[PDB]
């Protein structure tokens, strides 16, 4: 019924400007205005202002006010944010969301978010690498294994074991940031009868750089 | 502006019992709060507004109250899926403005951690590159302190530690704890041991390695 998807994520360096889009499908666009709301990182969720859908009319939170500028594509269903003279702690996750009434006080359903990253590093592919056990059973005919994907830049990546057909006993960290680039792993723990017996494989796509990789973790023990 | 206020921030109780969230504003704001809930790594869904006043869809467990200042969620039957940011929110008089949030942990009961050291790649000591990876899976309470330890010496320099966030379908959390190295300073020793302490134990898990065959 009512789904908001948004622009996919993206990374512009200081100075810039970039322009969200949130394409709203269910409602009748025109009766239902739009709440722009900013989680910040750490911060926690802060109204950035709302935009009547029918006149065409922004609010702006004050904290907003400036380099801030809400529009719409009316016609096609989509409101947008734009930031123009990006700073660099613009960086964030932006959400649209439905006003159930005027000024938006209520948001009832909300989009997936766009996440800005504000950063002059360069992007930077990946490094994936096998990481099978030196053996130790790891819990009872149990083998754990990984993947370690090194040193890309922005985030996100995409880490599937074997096309996502295994999915028990996955653990996937959450990327850290070194300085300039990102470190992530995942475990993967399988019988003793699933490998290396059966072919496990860790499929990363890091779509910044257009690398997708398939690491077959080989029994090397 | 109405500020709204939520304190604690973080909060426990096992499946099946209540917990009570506890928002406040700064002056009356005549019931009217809306409470979400943002699922980890989800956006906000819409809970309850005017205090008390149920989404479509939400089951009746989740109830709130509250009056004047004071304003409360509770939840009964604490699924493990509860797991969550609670946020209150004021929409009496512009601008909406939102409390910090409240986390929702689950507790369970104490698990080992499954520990798991892995020796560098191959192909990424080709890149000049030594990392040695350790998982600790599926552990509970969260507190686990990892020390690395290169022939002995408490490696604590060049260590990168990662975790989950408790998990929703078994209550548990996992680490990884990354000690990337030099090639030259990994072909320098030779014992290398990823040592954790946690509740579960009077005696440090150690894993350690130095590689054969299994």
């Known amino acids: 019924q009512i789904q908001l998807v948004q622009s996919g994520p993206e990374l512009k360096k200081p100075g810039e400007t970039v322009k969200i889009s949130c394409k709203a499908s269910?409602?009748?666009?025109?009766?239902?205005?739009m709440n722009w709301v900013k989680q910040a990182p750490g911060k926690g969720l802060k109204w950035m202002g709302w935009?009547?859908?029918?006149?065409?009319?922004?609010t702006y939170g004050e904290e907003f006010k400036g380099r801030f500028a809400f529009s719409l594509e009316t016609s096609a269903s989509t409101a947008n944010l734009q930031i123009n003279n990006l700073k660099n702690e613009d960086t964030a996750t932006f959400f649209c969301?439905?006003?159930?009434?005027?000024?938006?006080?209520?948001?009832?359903?909300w989009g997936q978010g766009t996440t800005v990253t504000v950063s002059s590093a360069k992007t930077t592919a990946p490094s994936v690498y096998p990481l099978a056990p030196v053996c130790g059973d790891t819990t009872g005919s149990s083998v754990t294994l990984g993947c370690l994907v090194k040193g890309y830049f922005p985030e996100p990546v995409t880490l599937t074991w074997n096309s996502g057909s295994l999915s028990s006993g996955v653990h996937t960290f959450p990327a850290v940031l070194q300085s300039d680039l990102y470190t992530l792993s995942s475990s993967v723990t399988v019988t003793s009868s699933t490998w290396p017996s059966q072919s496990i494989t860790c499929n990363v796509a890091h779509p910044a750089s257009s690398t997708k990789v398939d690491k077959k973790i080989e029994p090397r023990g | 502006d109405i500020v709204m206020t939520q304190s604690p921030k973080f909060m426990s109780t096992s499946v099946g019992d209540r917990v009570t969230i506890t928002c406040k504003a700064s002056?009356?704001?005549?019931?009217?709060v809306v409470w979400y809930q943002q699922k980890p790594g989800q956006s906000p869904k819409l809970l309850i507004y005017?205090?008390?006043t149920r989404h479509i869809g939400v089951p009746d467990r989740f109830a709130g109250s509250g009056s004047g200042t004071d304003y409360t969620l509770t939840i009964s039957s604490v699924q493990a899926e509860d797991l969550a940011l609670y946020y209150c929110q004021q929409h009496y008089s512009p601008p909406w403005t939102f409390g910090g949030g409240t986390k929702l942990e689950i507790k369970r009961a104490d698990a080992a951690p499954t520990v798991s050291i892995f020796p560098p790649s191959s192909e990424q000591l080709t890149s000049g590159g030594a990392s040695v990876v350790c998982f600790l899976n599926n552990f509970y309470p969260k507190d686990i302190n990892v020390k690395w330890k290169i022939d002995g010496s408490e490696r604590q320099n060049g260590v990168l530690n990662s975790w989950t966030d408790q998990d929703s379908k078994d209550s548990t959390y996992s680490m990884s704890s990354t000690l990337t190295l030099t090639k030259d300073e990994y072909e320098r020793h030779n014992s290398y041991t990823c040592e954790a302490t946690h509740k579960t134990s009077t005696s440090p898990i150690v894993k350690s390695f130095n590689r054969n065959e299994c």
């Open positions: 002056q009356d704001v005549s019931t009217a």
């Open positions: 969301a439905r006003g159930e009434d005027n000024f938006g006080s209520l948001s009832d359903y």
């Open positions: 935009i009547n859908t029918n006149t065409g009319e922004p």
């Open positions: 269910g409602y009748t666009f025109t009766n239902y205005g």
């Open positions: 005017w205090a008390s």
